[PDB]
Amino acid sequence: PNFSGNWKIIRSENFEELLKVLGVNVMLRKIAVAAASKYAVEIKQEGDTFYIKVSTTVYTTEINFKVGEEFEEQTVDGRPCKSLVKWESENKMVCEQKLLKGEGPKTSWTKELTNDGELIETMTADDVVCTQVFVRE
């Protein structure tokens, strides 16, 4: 499949509960939820290589990886981690993360292209799954 596109968020669920697991205090959780309503994802896919730019109104970052090749990024709350992405099916990829220093909750993310043209992203911390849904601009 082709994940390439400028993706705009239409739905976001359980993001506050995810940040709670990660230790973010309540006021910052509420503002982070508000920031997620301007969450946009720009993807350029070339084969198994992905160039991803994620952004909100005041913050943007780039995540570049090749499936099956370890890279370094951060968890959603900003802890550095080592990451590895694998395919789970034709249209879905899964990323397992391991903290680079210290310990913490078990975190991961997934990306899936649906047959209706939506992009579904999930982020997981231990038992809590946050789900975000996007459509192409």
Ligand SMILES: *C\C=C(C)/C=C/C=C(C)/C=C/C1=C(C)CCCC1(C)C
């Ligand atoms: C789609 C693949 C990856 C690795 C996406 C990572 C996304 C983030 C780290 C995004 C974090 C944000 C959220 C969820 C809400 C708005 C503010 C951020 C863009 C920092």
